[PDB]
């Protein structure tokens, strides 16, 4: 979680709440303004990720896998409840 005291790059109008250990907990609904997989640099500058999509999603995936360079990356998965909407082909 980017600490609000240091900040120096916080996104304008973002949530930054609902983050646990830098990641949104599974089963949590994320809206357009919310921040997911919070990240920082100069360890401070803010490199966190905002959701962005208009459609609110839910999170059921959290893991920190080792990459090909033996480095940790975020990789959270977002789930959408898609009924047959008007305009669906």
């Amino acid at each position: 979680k980017p600490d609000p005291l240091i900040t120096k790059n916080l996104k304008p109008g973002a949530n930054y709440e609902k983050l646990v250990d830098g990641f949104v907990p599974v089963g949590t609904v994320v809206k357009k303004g919310d921040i997911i997989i919070g990240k920082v640099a100069k360890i401070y500058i803010d490199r966190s990720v905002m959701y962005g999509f208009d459609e609110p999603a839910v999170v059921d995936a959290v893991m920190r896998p080792h990459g090909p360079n033996d480095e940790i990356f975020g990789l959270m998965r977002l789930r959408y409840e898609r009924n047959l909407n008007i305009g669906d082909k």
Partner: protein, 435 residues
């Protein structure tokens, strides 16, 4: 002071020379450094006097915060002259028309009068002009050939004896040319052959090279120019050191790659051959002209799938309420509309119809609707950005826009059902858009 409104009535194109760069340029590039801390280095290719591409610092030259600043040219005083990459063909057609020793034309200016002015010099270059004897200085005109392994280097053959026509030598030869030869060969006085050799190139404003890939070429060009000694004086057939010869070639080759890399053009004299060059940004569909000038990315526009609604008039479009609250209509606050705009202002983001933006003329600033509890009213002269309502006009367009009816104005019908996200139109309206 005051800069009165003006409109461009005409545009005149000319070849830019050393003097134009010197008077137009706002500074001179002297160092190859990039940044002194977080600020651009004074004298560097990033110096803020060329403009600003960051919100931290202004232009210094114009004191504008990036958006209002439009960049300013720089100067890189080349220690040795260079040929203008776009006008290599003109340099070739000028070399084999004038006497390399006395500047007077070797062709007959009398015989070329009856043609049109634009074609005179091309037709002069078309003739043989090989081994001709100059009338006024009795010096034999050599053979001019294009170096086959690059697009810029020239080779002067004197009955089998060859000596490289270096840009400095070409510059002296062209300076030997008088204005009478230029005019009588049809070329404009502003197109004098002297302008085709550059001793001070223009470092482009940071507006056209933002983000810290073309800057790599310029920085490479600045570095290799410093290696060139400032006291080079190349007379014809000097046989300069081959290390300097290789260094000079990179100076000319890098500048050519800076402008005409990956661009062929029909009049390119030559044959044998990263960041796209300056001239590569222009052509093709994704180029500067067809993508950024003849078209544009616009704000305050929405796109969605269309669908039929038999209960809408032919001049009405069904606009989902999610899109109507996103796009806004700018209504100014006056005496005649202050009563009408009050329900929009009071609703805010909370209820529809509402608004979240207010422009304060007293502060010349835009306020979001959350921070206007102390306002309690809007003053005359304010601009209110209110949500789109039923009855508003909207432009409705299907790509490809082939016919005149491909863009039409429909009366908005806001659909308040949150489960609808399509653009709804009457079926009879589809004949306008071929949809």
């Amino acid at each position: 002071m005051e800069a009165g409104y003006a409109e461009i009535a005409a545009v005149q194109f000319n070849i830019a020379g050393d003097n134009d760069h010197k008077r137009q340029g706002v500074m001179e590039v002297t160092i190859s450094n990039l940044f002194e801390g977080t600020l651009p280095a004074e004298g560097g290719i990033y110096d803020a006097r060329m403009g600003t591409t960051d919100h931290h610092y202004k232009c210094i030259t114009c004191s504008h915060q990036r958006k209002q600043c439009m960049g300013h040219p720089g100067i890189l005083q080349m220690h040795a002259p260079v040929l203008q990459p776009l006008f290599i063909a003109e340099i070739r057609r000028w070399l084999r028309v004038i006497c390399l020793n006395c500047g007077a034309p070797i062709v007959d200016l009398k015989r070329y009068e009856h043609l049109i002015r634009p074609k005179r010099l091309i037709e002069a270059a078309s003739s043989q002009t090989e081994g001709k004897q100059c009338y006024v200085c009795k010096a034999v005109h050599p053979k001019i050939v294009k170096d086959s392994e690059d697009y810029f280097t020239f080779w002067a053959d004197q009955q089998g004896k060859i000596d490289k026509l270096y840009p400095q030598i070409i510059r002296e030869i062209f300076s030997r040319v008088t204005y009478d030869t230029v005019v009588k060969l049809g070329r404009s006085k502003n197109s004098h052959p002297e302008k085709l050799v550059l001793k001070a190139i223009q470092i482009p404003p940071i507006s056209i090279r933002p983000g810290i890939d073309i800057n790599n070429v310029i920085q490479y060009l600045v570095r290799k120019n410093l290696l060139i000694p400032k006291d080079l004086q190349i007379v014809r057939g000097q046989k300069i050191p081959l290390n300097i010869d290789r260094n000079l070639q990179t100076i000319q080759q890098l500048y050519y790659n800076f402008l005409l890399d990956s661009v062929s053009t029909t009049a390119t004299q030559g044959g044998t051959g990263p960041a796209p060059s300056i001239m590569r940004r222009l052509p093709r569909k994704e180029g500067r002209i067809r993508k950024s000038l003849l078209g544009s990315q616009v704000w305050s526009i929405s796109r969605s799938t269309i669908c039929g609604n038999s209960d809408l008039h032919l001049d009405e479009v069904g606009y989902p309420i999610s899109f109507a609250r996103t796009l806004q209509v700018a209504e100014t606050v006056q005496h005649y509309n202050i009563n009408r705009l009050m329900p929009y202002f009071l609703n805010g983001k909370r209820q529809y119809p509402g608004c979240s933006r207010v422009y304060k003329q007293i502060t010349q600033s835009v306020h979001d609707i959350e921070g206007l509890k102390q306002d309690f009213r809007l003053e005359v002269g304010d601009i209110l950005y209110r949500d789109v309502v039923t009855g508003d006009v909207a432009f409705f367009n299907r790509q490809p826009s082939l016919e005149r009816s491909s863009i039409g104005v429909h009366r908005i019908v806001v659909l308040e059902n949150p489960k609808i996200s399509t653009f709804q139109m009457n079926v009879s309206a589809c004949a306008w858009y071929n949809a």
